Amino acid sequence: VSKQQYADANAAYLQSKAAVEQARINLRYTKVLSPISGRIGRSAVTEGALVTNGQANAMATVQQLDPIYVDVTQPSTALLRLRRELASGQLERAGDNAAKVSLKLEDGSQYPLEGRLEFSEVSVDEGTGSVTIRAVFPNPNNELLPGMFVHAQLQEG
Amino acid sequence: RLFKEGSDVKAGQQLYQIDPATYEADYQSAQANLASTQEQAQRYKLLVADQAVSKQQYADANAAYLQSKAAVEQARINLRYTKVLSPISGRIGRSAVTEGALVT
Amino acid sequence: NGQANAMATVQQLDPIYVDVTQPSTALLRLRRELASGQLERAGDNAAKVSLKLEDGSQYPLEGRLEFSEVSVDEGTGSVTIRAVFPNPNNELLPGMFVHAQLQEG
């Protein structure tokens, strides 16, 4: 055979192998593999329900509980006056352990471990007038659950 | 998720990865056709000098060559969409989704 | 094809699930069993106890506990707790408002 005949026969073979892989992907989707590793909740749908590709309502949730985030709201007037009296007027001398955050639970009991914060939302909400800060806490015993109301005690200079 | 939250991102910086796995197979199926018709276009460009192949045969060969090159360019932009490049430069906020969510 | 509203609905009545709500301000208090009271030293008896129907009568059979929801809600601050109950004579129906008794330590 000519070399170009081997070339486009090999190309037809590679195209059909790619189509086989395209079918194998959809065959892999019918066994719903979990995307991450974590604690799974309860099933929103049971055996017999009909699902649809890319539907909005979920069927289950998987969550990782270690570490945990703490989202914190602070009003923008307080941040404005802190930014004012940090440099202008007396210097409040921001400090070295400005990362350290300790939280309190609903019953006033202290969380034994401590976490650190990083900023993640430079925007003022139009409904509440408050910026949002985010801290990361270690959660080795699952004492903190996603959604709980806590009190983060920061260090404003 | 390949960005630190609350940081400065530049234009064109990759922020995510959306599991190509289908666009990879589309890219392979396009490049298999490109690697075939490009060789025929070059061979007919060599043969058309000393008239072993008519001019219309070469003008139909390089047209299919350019069509397969456009198909590979169509596969490459879908492969570039799976790495979500930052459209502008600025401050990125909190990620509304985490690793494991299904997008559309 | 794939419309939202259903044509009919089929249901299995045996067994049956009971989803109760516990305030999350109570289970972290229950996690303070090391000082006040003592720990859940009940073994398999800490699985489950019975259920109270709508009219205040007692269900004759007992159930079994499997936890399924480690997530509190923002509105009421409560955790969802699931239990399973045998239903041989279709006394319990899906949707009734019941009061499940549980086991602390």
PDB file of C-alpha atoms in Angstrom, chain B:
ATOM      1  CA  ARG B   1      -9.020  25.528  42.220  1.00  0.00           C
ATOM      2  CA  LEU B   2      -5.709  27.181  41.373  1.00  0.00           C
ATOM      3  CA  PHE B   3      -5.999  30.642  42.932  1.00  0.00           C
ATOM      4  CA  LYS B   4      -5.614  31.877  46.484  1.00  0.00           C
ATOM      5  CA  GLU B   5      -8.756  33.693  47.586  1.00  0.00           C
ATOM      6  CA  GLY B   6      -8.655  37.428  48.150  1.00  0.00           C
ATOM      7  CA  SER B   7      -5.550  37.841  46.005  1.00  0.00           C
ATOM      8  CA  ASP B   8      -4.549  39.794  42.928  1.00  0.00           C
ATOM      9  CA  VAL B   9      -5.002  37.845  39.709  1.00  0.00           C
ATOM     10  CA  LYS B  10      -3.653  38.844  36.315  1.00  0.00           C
ATOM     11  CA  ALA B  11      -5.299  38.588  32.922  1.00  0.00           C
ATOM     12  CA  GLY B  12      -5.100  35.119  31.420  1.00  0.00           C
ATOM     13  CA  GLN B  13      -4.250  33.426  34.722  1.00  0.00           C
ATOM     14  CA  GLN B  14      -5.804  29.980  35.076  1.00  0.00           C
ATOM     15  CA  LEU B  15      -8.282  29.816  37.956  1.00  0.00           C
ATOM     16  CA  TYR B  16      -9.851  26.347  37.746  1.00  0.00           C
ATOM     17  CA  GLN B  17      -9.802  23.050  35.871  1.00  0.00           C
ATOM     18  CA  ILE B  18     -13.037  21.512  34.649  1.00  0.00           C
ATOM     19  CA  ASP B  19     -11.953  17.899  33.922  1.00  0.00           C
ATOM     20  CA  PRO B  20     -11.389  17.909  30.133  1.00  0.00           C
ATOM     21  CA  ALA B  21     -11.873  14.170  29.470  1.00  0.00           C
ATOM     22  CA  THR B  22     -14.199  14.782  26.454  1.00  0.00           C
ATOM     23  CA  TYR B  23     -12.508  17.791  24.904  1.00  0.00           C
ATOM     24  CA  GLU B  24      -9.279  15.792  25.069  1.00  0.00           C
ATOM     25  CA  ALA B  25     -10.910  13.086  22.952  1.00  0.00           C
ATOM     26  CA  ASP B  26     -12.325  15.740  20.605  1.00  0.00           C
ATOM     27  CA  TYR B  27      -8.837  17.250  20.292  1.00  0.00           C
ATOM     28  CA  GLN B  28      -7.376  13.816  19.554  1.00  0.00           C
ATOM     29  CA  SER B  29     -10.062  13.085  16.951  1.00  0.00           C
ATOM     30  CA  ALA B  30      -9.348  16.419  15.268  1.00  0.00           C
ATOM     31  CA  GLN B  31      -5.565  16.038  15.331  1.00  0.00           C
ATOM     32  CA  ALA B  32      -5.810  12.523  13.878  1.00  0.00           C
ATOM     33  CA  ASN B  33      -7.522  13.984  10.809  1.00  0.00           C
ATOM     34  CA  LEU B  34      -5.077  16.903  10.667  1.00  0.00           C
ATOM     35  CA  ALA B  35      -2.015  14.613  10.756  1.00  0.00           C
ATOM     36  CA  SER B  36      -3.513  12.694   7.815  1.00  0.00           C
ATOM     37  CA  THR B  37      -4.602  15.434   5.433  1.00  0.00           C
ATOM     38  CA  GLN B  38      -1.532  17.633   5.997  1.00  0.00           C
ATOM     39  CA  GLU B  39       0.730  14.876   4.684  1.00  0.00           C
ATOM     40  CA  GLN B  40      -1.444  14.558   1.580  1.00  0.00           C
ATOM     41  CA  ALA B  41      -1.350  18.325   1.056  1.00  0.00           C
ATOM     42  CA  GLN B  42       2.456  18.361   1.291  1.00  0.00           C
ATOM     43  CA  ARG B  43       2.795  15.332  -0.998  1.00  0.00           C
ATOM     44  CA  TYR B  44       0.527  16.903  -3.607  1.00  0.00           C
ATOM     45  CA  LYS B  45       2.439  20.183  -3.293  1.00  0.00           C
ATOM     46  CA  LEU B  46       5.606  18.259  -4.120  1.00  0.00           C
ATOM     47  CA  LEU B  47       4.031  16.339  -7.005  1.00  0.00           C
ATOM     48  CA  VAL B  48       2.230  19.319  -8.561  1.00  0.00           C
ATOM     49  CA  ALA B  49       5.544  20.880  -9.633  1.00  0.00           C
ATOM     50  CA  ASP B  50       6.394  18.234 -12.244  1.00  0.00           C
ATOM     51  CA  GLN B  51       2.707  17.721 -13.167  1.00  0.00           C
ATOM     52  CA  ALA B  52       2.242  14.208 -11.759  1.00  0.00           C
ATOM     53  CA  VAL B  53      -0.933  15.502 -10.059  1.00  0.00           C
ATOM     54  CA  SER B  54      -3.349  18.008 -11.606  1.00  0.00           C
ATOM     55  CA  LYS B  55      -3.811  21.500 -10.188  1.00  0.00           C
ATOM     56  CA  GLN B  56      -7.412  20.893  -9.126  1.00  0.00           C
ATOM     57  CA  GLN B  57      -6.415  17.832  -7.085  1.00  0.00           C
ATOM     58  CA  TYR B  58      -3.894  19.884  -5.102  1.00  0.00           C
ATOM     59  CA  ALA B  59      -6.362  22.763  -4.745  1.00  0.00           C
ATOM     60  CA  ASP B  60      -8.859  20.305  -3.269  1.00  0.00           C
ATOM     61  CA  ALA B  61      -6.202  18.714  -1.049  1.00  0.00           C
ATOM     62  CA  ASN B  62      -5.027  21.909   0.627  1.00  0.00           C
ATOM     63  CA  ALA B  63      -8.642  23.015   1.141  1.00  0.00           C
ATOM     64  CA  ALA B  64      -9.318  19.891   3.218  1.00  0.00           C
ATOM     65  CA  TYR B  65      -5.991  20.539   4.962  1.00  0.00           C
ATOM     66  CA  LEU B  66      -7.135  24.030   5.984  1.00  0.00           C
ATOM     67  CA  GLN B  67     -10.552  22.698   7.027  1.00  0.00           C
ATOM     68  CA  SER B  68      -8.953  20.148   9.346  1.00  0.00           C
ATOM     69  CA  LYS B  69      -6.631  22.847  10.699  1.00  0.00           C
ATOM     70  CA  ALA B  70      -9.713  24.940  11.484  1.00  0.00           C
ATOM     71  CA  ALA B  71     -11.280  21.918  13.202  1.00  0.00           C
ATOM     72  CA  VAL B  72      -8.173  21.524  15.381  1.00  0.00           C
ATOM     73  CA  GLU B  73      -8.373  25.243  16.180  1.00  0.00           C
ATOM     74  CA  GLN B  74     -12.013  24.685  17.158  1.00  0.00           C
ATOM     75  CA  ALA B  75     -10.977  21.863  19.484  1.00  0.00           C
ATOM     76  CA  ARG B  76      -8.191  23.934  21.057  1.00  0.00           C
ATOM     77  CA  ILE B  77     -10.502  26.715  22.228  1.00  0.00           C
ATOM     78  CA  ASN B  78     -12.814  24.208  23.919  1.00  0.00           C
ATOM     79  CA  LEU B  79      -9.698  22.744  25.503  1.00  0.00           C
ATOM     80  CA  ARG B  80      -8.701  26.249  26.616  1.00  0.00           C
ATOM     81  CA  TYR B  81     -12.150  26.837  28.131  1.00  0.00           C
ATOM     82  CA  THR B  82     -11.592  23.990  30.612  1.00  0.00           C
ATOM     83  CA  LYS B  83      -8.750  25.999  32.165  1.00  0.00           C
ATOM     84  CA  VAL B  84     -10.735  29.046  33.218  1.00  0.00           C
ATOM     85  CA  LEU B  85      -8.457  31.940  32.368  1.00  0.00           C
ATOM     86  CA  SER B  86      -9.098  35.181  34.202  1.00  0.00           C
ATOM     87  CA  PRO B  87     -10.774  37.592  31.752  1.00  0.00           C
ATOM     88  CA  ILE B  88      -9.418  40.757  33.394  1.00  0.00           C
ATOM     89  CA  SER B  89      -6.846  41.554  36.063  1.00  0.00           C
ATOM     90  CA  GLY B  90      -7.920  42.620  39.522  1.00  0.00           C
ATOM     91  CA  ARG B  91      -8.783  41.314  42.967  1.00  0.00           C
ATOM     92  CA  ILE B  92     -10.500  37.945  43.031  1.00  0.00           C
ATOM     93  CA  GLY B  93     -13.059  37.263  45.718  1.00  0.00           C
ATOM     94  CA  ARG B  94     -14.377  34.203  47.514  1.00  0.00           C
ATOM     95  CA  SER B  95     -14.976  31.189  45.280  1.00  0.00           C
ATOM     96  CA  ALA B  96     -18.708  30.529  45.062  1.00  0.00           C
ATOM     97  CA  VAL B  97     -18.054  26.870  44.206  1.00  0.00           C
ATOM     98  CA  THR B  98     -15.464  24.416  45.477  1.00  0.00           C
ATOM     99  CA  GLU B  99     -13.779  21.368  43.973  1.00  0.00           C
ATOM    100  CA  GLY B 100     -16.377  18.761  43.038  1.00  0.00           C
ATOM    101  CA  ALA B 101     -19.246  20.952  41.807  1.00  0.00           C
ATOM    102  CA  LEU B 102     -20.834  20.365  38.406  1.00  0.00           C
ATOM    103  CA  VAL B 103     -20.969  23.416  36.150  1.00  0.00           C
ATOM    104  CA  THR B 104     -22.826  24.084  32.913  1.00  0.00           C
TER     105      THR B 104
END
